[PDB]
RNA sequence: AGCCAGGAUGUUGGCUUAGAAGCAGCCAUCAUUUAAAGAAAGCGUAAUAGCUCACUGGUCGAGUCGGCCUGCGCGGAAGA
């Protein structure tokens, strides 16, 4: 995007619909609109699946509030959604918490391509791999 | 504190604190705290500057004190007059003179070593340096 | 493969010694083999640096002195007590 | 300011200055960082 | 040494995440298009964010950087 003009990246969990108890007012001390979190976002986020955060850009322009397009799903609740335990890494890499299967991190790698840093499968493969090595996740091989 | 577990005599003589010293190559460890000064050590200044040590290179390493107290010092009371017998034993030195490798260390980086050994002589009473394990 | 250039010592004791050290030499000997043991003085500084290498008590070295070559090997070093200088090498033949 | 009688650099902008034969520590991050008389 | 530029993605990495989204938290501390980049070295937040730097390019046109051994000095150093 821009140079940054009122764009943050705040929320939880989507599949409700405007998180009061968590963040609140977060996403409405800048210019972003507190009523499109609740309908016209589940509006754009049942295209695909629903019960992911979304770290989004929304420029406020001087429009009405702004225009939000989403994009990348996060790899955080994707690497929770199969881990293991629900509750969460706490010190993981130190004992084996938690395993993923990496074919479906190279699908979900080779889907996701806007928000990377990488031009091959292999090069942006144990990037998520090295998300693994974050909360500790022992890869099958 | 260190001290003898069971001396032969309770009370020692003052004596003299002359010449250079034995212990003066790093001989166990890797990195040495060799003192410049004469003076003598208590065993609270050499268990404090061990803390110093043991604190600043953390359970990691392993530290050698090279010195031992072994010399009763006696004190006289307050208000009580001169004679009628030698004091009593109150603490105990290491005497020292310039050359004892006062502590070794090994299994760290030379740079904390020289950290721990900085940390630590600023609790010794005398002028000390920092030597490391030279080959013959 | 250190050359290290000497001198011959005409005097020697305590006395000497220490006059010796003081202009900024030290001496030495070099005993072994056959021949009469050879009291050398020697520069401190190019020894100092020299020694700081683990190659000066390992390799064997080279000693000028009177213009000839004797190919020595470091036996042992008195050190000074509490500072970085040498009081003494013993040289054995090699 | 501080004065001790041990003066140091205490953080990276600190910057030892010697006015009228007083060595001082001048900071420009942190005030707290002045010192006086090493 | 100045001066002109770049310095990211998974990375909301989960957190006891009540707000930490590198910033009152612990384990990790990886991998890439790249000259170069720390799941952030300093500050900083209701909270992302905001900057600078660690590193690299250009300008610059001769020394510079930090230790050791030393001589002489400075501070530490207030009394009727």
Same mark, same amino acid.
């Given at each position: ?30 210019? =972003? ?9 589940? %509006? ?24 939000? =397009? ?42 996701? %391509? ?28 | ?136 | ?94 | 300011?501080?004065? *001790? ?18 060595? *001082? ?14």
């Amino acid at each position: 995007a821009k140079k940054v003009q009122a764009y943050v990246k705040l929320q939880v969990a989507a599949g409700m619909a405007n998180p009061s108890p968590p963040v609140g007012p977060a996403l409405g001390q800048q210019g =972003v609109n507190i009523m499109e979190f609740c309908k016209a976002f589940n %509006a754009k986020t049942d295209s695909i699946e629903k019960g992911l955060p979304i770290p989004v850009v929304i420029t406020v322009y001087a429009d009405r509030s702004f225009t939000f =397009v989403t994009k990348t799903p996060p790899a955080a609740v994707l690497l929770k959604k199969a881990a293991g335990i629900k509750s969460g890494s706490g010190k993981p890499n130190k004992d084996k918490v938690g395993k993923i299967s990496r074919a479906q991190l190279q699908e979900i790698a080779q889907t996701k %391509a806007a928000d990377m840093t990488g031009a091959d499968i292999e090069a942006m493969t144990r990037s998520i791999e090295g998300t693994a090595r974050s909360m500790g996740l022992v890869v099958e091989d | 504190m260190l001290q003898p577990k069971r001396t032969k005599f309770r009370k020692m003589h003052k004596g003299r604190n002359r010449g250079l010293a034995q212990g003066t190559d790093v001989s166990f460890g890797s990195f040495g705290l060799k003192a410049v000064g004469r003076g003598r050590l208590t065993a609270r200044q050499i268990e404090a500057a061990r803390r110093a040590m043991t604190r600043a290179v953390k359970r990691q390493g392993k530290i050698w004190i090279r010195v031992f107290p072994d010399k009763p010092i006696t004190e006289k009371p307050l208000a009580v007059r001169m004679g009628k017998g030698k004091g009593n034993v109150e603490y105990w030195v290491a005497l020292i003179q310039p050359g004892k490798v006062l502590y070794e260390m090994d299994g760290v980086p030379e740079e904390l070593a020289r950290e721990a050994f900085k940390l630590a002589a600023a609790k010794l009473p005398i002028k000390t340096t920092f030597v490391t394990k030279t080959v013959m | 493969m250190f050359t290290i250039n000497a001198e011959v010592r005409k005097e020697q004791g305590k006395g000497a010694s220490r006059r010796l050290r003081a202009a900024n030499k030290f001496p030495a000997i070099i005993y072994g083999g056959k021949e009469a043991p050879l009291a050398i003085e020697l520069d401190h500084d190019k020894v100092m640096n020299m020694q700081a290498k683990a190659e000066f008590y390992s390799e064997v070295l080279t000693i000028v002195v009177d213009g000839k070559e004797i190919k020595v090997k470091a036996q042992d070093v008195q050190r000074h007590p509490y500072k970085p200088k040498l009081q003494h090498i013993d040289f054995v033949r090699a | 300011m501080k004065v *001790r009688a041990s003066v140091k650099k205490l953080c990276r902008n600190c910057k030892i200055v010697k006015r009228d034969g007083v060595i *001082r520590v001048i900071c420009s991050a942190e005030p707290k960082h002045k010192q006086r008389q090493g």
